[PDB]
Amino acid sequence: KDNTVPLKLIALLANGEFHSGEQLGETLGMSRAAINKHIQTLRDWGVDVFTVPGKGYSLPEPIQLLNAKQILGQLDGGSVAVLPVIDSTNQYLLDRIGELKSGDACIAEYQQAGRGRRGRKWFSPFGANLYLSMFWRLEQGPAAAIGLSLVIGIVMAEVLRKLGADKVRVKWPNDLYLQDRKLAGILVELTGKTGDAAQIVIGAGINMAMRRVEESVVNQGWITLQEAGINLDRNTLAAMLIRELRAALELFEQEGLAPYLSRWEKLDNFINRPVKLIIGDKEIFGISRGIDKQGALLLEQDGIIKPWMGGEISLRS
Amino acid sequence: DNTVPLKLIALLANGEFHSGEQLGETLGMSRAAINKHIQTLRDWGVDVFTVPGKGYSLPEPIQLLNAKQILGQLDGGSVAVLPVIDSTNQYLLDRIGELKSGDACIAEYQQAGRGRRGRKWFSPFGANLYLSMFWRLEQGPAAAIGLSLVIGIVMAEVLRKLGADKVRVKWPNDLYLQDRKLAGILVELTGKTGDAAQIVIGAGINMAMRRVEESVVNQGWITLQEAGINLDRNTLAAMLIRELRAALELFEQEGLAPYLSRWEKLDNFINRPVKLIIGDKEIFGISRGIDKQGALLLEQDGIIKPWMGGEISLRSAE
Ligand SMILES: Nc1ncnc2c1ncn2[C@@H]1O[C@H](COP(=O)(O)OCCCCC[C@@H]2SC[C@@H]3NC(=O)N[C@@H]32)[C@@H](O)[C@H]1O
Ligand SMILES: Nc1ncnc2c1ncn2[C@@H]1O[C@H](COP(=O)(O)OCCCCC[C@@H]2SC[C@@H]3NC(=O)N[C@@H]32)[C@@H](O)[C@H]1O
């Protein structure tokens, strides 16, 4: 229920070097046994820590802790809150909706209640991945939310394809895949009034340096950038994402989906494959062929191609 | 706290004279104190005038809202009647977790009634209908604009059927009669793309209101009474609740299609010069109705484009 010690601890180990319990316990003022209890809390947070007789405690690889002012300096205005431990970055912005401005972001080292759609859970181990959320004020209201979801998918895919990710594709209308496994989850939440503006919170959970996953939280099948072959400074990659999304949406307000229609066709990881759609709880099946101009997924269930505006797509086993 | 001003208006609601005498006893207070609530009522928008020699009175009887009565004309679904509330929309939005599609609430008075872009909805006590209904859409945020069009269509159709012959709709929310606002409709929602959407529909229908606070209502306004239609609020609420429920069942299941042409015949601005405000941008053109997706079709210099968002309004000189 109290996080200061384990945080101070991860700050120490964060350099990838050995710290003996004797030294840690000295720096921190507690018994060696107590220093191990905190080491144990870090392990619960998803931090991987080992011990080596003589040397001490270590991280398999260094961690580059997020630095607000560091990411801020690579930006054009905008505000960025960097949080050690949060319930959900999305929740964090939703709660601050009235003081926010478009493109404001919030990013955390660790989520204790990271979430997805349909009440699902999003595995968020400390410091291994990017847990980033950005706020946006869509002047053209809720009707524009889906197209917005599509722009985000296309943009993040682009930023990562330019860094080594070849087979990184998008999922209609949220999430990134690669070699056919959730590489990143995107959760767009919103409050609006039809005929007025929509307040939007975009949440992205990008799998980067993660090594092991908890089978009963992630049954699905996952993948990481680290397994793609890339090691991005989270601080660097957050910069590039906020920069690009802020510009891509500024542009989508001005031109709609139009400039993104073709880009979606190349990136759809599901264009032309046996899929399945879920509406509430009533199952429905078929095949797919891109989207239309208003961003609706095009579903051919037996010869005829009808467009659906909602639901969750997925390959069928 | 106002347990009392309510006890007081329950007593005055029939429109009969009730002297400062009678009141004092069947209300346990000094006539000087009972005169303090009669002012709280004036502050809530009730026109209480006192005529020494006969007592206090209301210019016209008020048929207080009665949950039992309403509920008894419906089949299932909760209908919460709230004497005094801040906003019927806020009431439901605050209960999204326990509400089921079609649950509703009505109030006599709204202390913070609201419209779009941070505007106030003038809501004097017991003169108008202030109703909200909750709905859970599995299609998510995309379907919200369609939902708004259905509500306007259905509400208009009901009032026309009840006798106000020329009531029309404004894309995508609100009802008009003779180019003045008859009913304000405010649809709010929370949701996530790719999941459900929780929607709260708010209706502010002008009925018996005789005067307005000019600094809240500066545009034209009109009541059902001026349309010659004199309805009981409980009766209309039951009617509207039953009809919106059936229409949203139909929408949920078949979308906008079954409503498309019904729209074109009720549109108040079709083929007329309008202004579309988006954010801080006013753009001008001619309305041409809606497309199958519910987007407004705006013609600007011979070219027609679909607009999925924005606020519309009439343009005309004097
Ligand atoms: N790390 C993971 N990698 C691969 N699969 C996983 C991972 N964690 C959980 N899963 C699996 O994803 C499934 C479905 O997620 P989704 O609801 O489609 O998901 C939509 C997107 C969720 C968004 C995450 C971001 S983090 C920043 C922001 N804050 C927040 O609470 N959510 C978003 C889960 O139930 C689980 O099987
Ligand atoms: N009683 C009135 N009659 C005619 N004009 C008026 C009235 N009150 C205020 N106005 C004018 O309406 C304008 C704007 O309304 P709107 O945002 O288009 O409006 C969208 C719809 C408003 C929603 C009202 C309902 S009441 C039940 C529910 N609860 C709640 O808080 N809002 C909705 C106001 O700024 C004002 O000039």
B124 lines ligand 2 (CB under 6 A): no
CB contacts of A187 in chain B (<8 Å) are: 192
Structure-token pair, residue B176? 């008009």
CB count, 10 Å around CB of B261? Answer: 9
Expressed in percent and rounded to 5, the helix, strand and coil fractions of chain B are 30, 30, 40
Distance (Å) from the alpha carbon of B196 to chain A's nearest alpha carbon:
7
**A-B contacts at Cβ under 8 angstroms:** 116
Put simply, the answer to whether B188 touches A189 (Cβ < 8 Å) is no
Amino acid at B34: I
Nearest to B41 by CA among B108, B128, B97: B108
Residues with Cβ within 8 Å of A56's Cβ and at least 6 positions away in sequence, in order, are A18, A19, A20, A21, A22, A23, A24
Q: Which residue has the tokens 């709204």?
A: B110
d(CA B300, CA B273): 10
B223 lines ligand 2 (CB under 6 A): no
In chain A, domain spans: 1-63, 64-269, 270-317
CA geometry: angle B146, B122, B310, nearest 5 deg: 35
- Indicate the residue of B193, B278, B309 with minimum beta-carbon distance to A146: B193
Chain A contact probe: residue of B96, B192, B199, B283 with most A CBs at under 10 A: B192
Ligand 1: which residues within 6 Å by Cβ? A 88-90, 111, 114-117, 120-123, 131, 133, 175, 182, 185-187, 203-205, 207, 217-220, 222
Output the DSSP codes for chain A.
---HHHHHHHHHHTTS--B-HHHHHHHHTS-HHHHHHHHHHHHHTT---EEETTTEEE-SS------HHHHHTTSSS--EEEEEEES-HHHHHHTTTTT--TT-EEEEEEESS-B-STT-B----TTTSEEEEEEEEETT-GGGHHHHHHHHHHHHHHHHHTTT-SSEEE-SSS-EEETTEEEEEEEEEEEEETTS-EEEEEEEEE--S-----TTT--S-B--HHHHT----HHHHHHHHHHHHHHHHHHHHHHTTGGGHHHHHHHBTTTTS-EEEEETTEEEEEEEEEE-SSS-EEEESSS-EEEE-SSEEEE--
d(CA A263, CA A296): 15
CB count, 10 Å around CB of A224? Answer: 20
Amino acid at B48: V
- The chain B residues in contact with chain A (CB within 8 A) are 116-117, 138-145, 147-148, 172-173, 186-196, 278-279, 293-295, 307-311
Beta pairing, strands A176-178 & A181-193: antiparallel
- The rounded Å distance from CA B119 to ligand 2 centre is 7
**DSSP one-letter code for B34:** H
Question: Which ligand 2 atom lies nearest to the CA of residue B86?
Answer: 31
**Could you tell me if A261 and A298 are in contact, meaning their C-beta atoms sit under 8 angstroms apart?**
no
**Could you tell me if B54 and B19 are in contact, meaning their C-beta atoms sit under 8 angstroms apart?**
yes
Give the ligand with the smallest distance to the CA of B187: 2
Cα B92 to Cα A114, B140, B198, B199: the distances in Å are 26, 18, 10, 9
B122 lines ligand 2 (CB under 6 A): yes
Structure-token pair, residue A150? 């599509």
Helix (H) or strand (E) holding B213: none
CATH 3.40.50.1970 fits B1-62, yes or no: no
Put simply, the answer to whether B309 touches A193 (Cβ < 8 Å) is no
Put simply, the answer to whether B142 touches A311 (Cβ < 8 Å) is no
d(CA B85, CA B156): 26
CA geometry: angle A91, A280, A86, nearest 5 deg: 15
Q: Which residue has the tokens 């799998």?
A: A207
Cα B316 to Cα B108, B169, B222, B313: the distances in Å are 36, 18, 19, 10
Check the annotation: does B300 bind a ligand.
no
Structure-token pair, residue A47? 């931090």
**Residue A157: exposed, middle, or buried by beta-carbon count in 10 A (0-12, 13-18, 19+)?**
buried
d(CA B125, CA B123): 6
Q: What resolution in angstroms does the PDB record give?
A: 2.8
Cα A316 to Cα A167, A218, A264, A276, A285: the distances in Å are 20, 18, 21, 6, 9
Bridge partners of residue B205, in order along the sequence: B129, B183
d(CA B310, CA B302): 21
d(CA B194, CA A278): 9
Cα B308 to Cα A55, B145, B311: the distances in Å are 63, 8, 10
d(CA A229, CA A64): 18
Residues with Cβ within 8 Å of B26's Cβ and at least 6 positions away in sequence, in order, are B11
**Which SS3 state, helix, strand or coil, does residue B290 take?**
strand
> What dotted CATH number matches B269-318?
2.30.30.100
Nearest to B256 by CA among B139, B162, B160: B139
Structure-token pair, residue A32? 């060696």
Q: Which residue has the tokens 């997805």?
A: A116
Give the ligand with the smallest distance to the CA of A208: 1
d(CA A26, CA A113): 33
Q: Per residue, what are the HEC states of B237-281?
A: HHHHHHHHHHHHHHHHHHCCHHHHHHHHHHECCCCCEEEEEECCE
Nearest-10 crossing angle of helices A145-161, A234-255: 140
Question: Which ligand 1 atom lies nearest to the CA of residue A220?
Answer: 37
**Which SS3 state, helix, strand or coil, does residue B289 take?**
strand
Distance (Å) from the alpha carbon of B114 to chain A's nearest alpha carbon:
11
**DSSP one-letter code for B26:** T
Residues with Cβ within 8 Å of B307's Cβ and at least 6 positions away in sequence, in order, are A140, B276, B278, B295, B296, B297, B298
State the CATH architecture for A1-63: Orthogonal Bundle (1.10)
Task: Catalogue the long-range contacts made by B250-258 (C-beta closer than 8 Å, 24 or more residues apart).
Answer: B251/B143, B251/B146, B251/B147, B251/B150, B252/B137, B252/B138, B252/B139, B255/B143, B255/B146, B256/B146, B256/B149, B256/B150, B256/B292, B256/B293, B256/B294, B257/B292
Put simply, the answer to whether B172 touches A194 (Cβ < 8 Å) is yes
Helices (DSSP H) in chain B: which residue ranges? 3-12, 20-25, 31-43, 67-71, 88-93, 144-161, 233-254, 260-266
d(CA A73, CA A66): 13
Question: Which ligand 1 atom lies nearest to the CA of residue A121?
Answer: 35
Q: Tell which one of A87, A122, A132 to mutate to probe ligand 1, the residue whose CB is within 8 A of the most ligand atoms.
A: A122
Structure-token pair, residue A293? 């101009």
> What dotted CATH number matches A270-317?
2.30.30.100
Q: Which residue has the tokens 């599995």?
A: B138
Q: Tell which one of B121, B177, B186, B212 to mutate to probe ligand 2, the residue whose CB is within 8 A of the most ligand atoms.
A: B121
Distance (Å) from the alpha carbon of A193 to chain B's nearest alpha carbon:
4
Structure-token pair, residue A247? 């510009």
Task: Catalogue the long-range contacts made by A50-59 (C-beta closer than 8 Å, 24 or more residues apart).
Answer: A52/A18, A55/A18, A55/A20, A56/A18, A56/A19, A56/A20, A56/A21, A56/A22, A56/A23, A56/A24, A57/A13, A57/A18, A57/A19, A57/A20, A57/A21, A57/A24, A58/A13, A58/A16, A58/A17, A58/A18, A58/A19, A59/A13, A59/A14, A59/A16
Q: Which residue has the tokens 């990143």?
A: A184
Nearest to B70 by CA among B110, B98, B105, B108: B105
CA geometry: angle A239, A243, A244, nearest 5 deg: 120
If you measure CA to CA, which chain B residue comes closest to A202? Answer: B192
State the CATH architecture for B63-268: 2-Layer Sandwich (3.30)
CB contacts of B147 in chain A (<8 Å) are: 194
d(CA A159, CA A141): 27
**Could you tell me if A100 and A135 are in contact, meaning their C-beta atoms sit under 8 angstroms apart?**
yes
Phi and psi angles of residue A136, each rounded to the nearest 5 degrees, phi first: -145, 145
Distance (Å) from the alpha carbon of A283 to chain B's nearest alpha carbon:
12
Nearest to A99 by CA among A79, A73, A85: A79
**Which SS3 state, helix, strand or coil, does residue B201 take?**
strand
State the CATH architecture for A64-269: 2-Layer Sandwich (3.30)
**Residue B55: exposed, middle, or buried by beta-carbon count in 10 A (0-12, 13-18, 19+)?**
middle
Chain B contact probe: residue of A193, A202, A284, A314 with most B CBs at under 10 A: A193
**Could you tell me if A118 and A141 are in contact, meaning their C-beta atoms sit under 8 angstroms apart?**
no
Put simply, the answer to whether B141 touches A190 (Cβ < 8 Å) is yes
**Which SS3 state, helix, strand or coil, does residue B175 take?**
strand
**Residue A180: exposed, middle, or buried by beta-carbon count in 10 A (0-12, 13-18, 19+)?**
middle
**Could you tell me if B177 and B222 are in contact, meaning their C-beta atoms sit under 8 angstroms apart?**
yes
Asked if residue B306 has a cis previous peptide bond (ω within 30° of 0), the answer is no
Q: How far apart are the first and last CA of chain B?
A: 47
Q: Which residue has the tokens 């264009």?
A: A271
**DSSP one-letter code for B133:** E
B112 lines ligand 2 (CB under 6 A): no
- The rounded Å distance from CA A183 to ligand 1 centre is 10
User: Which amino acids of A are annotated catalytic?
Assistant: 117, 182, 316
CA geometry: angle B188, B189, B191, nearest 5 deg: 170
Amino acid at B102: G
**Which SS3 state, helix, strand or coil, does residue B50 take?**
strand
Cα A192 to Cα A35, A302, B42, B130, B170: the distances in Å are 48, 37, 34, 20, 19
Put simply, the answer to whether B145 touches A142 (Cβ < 8 Å) is yes
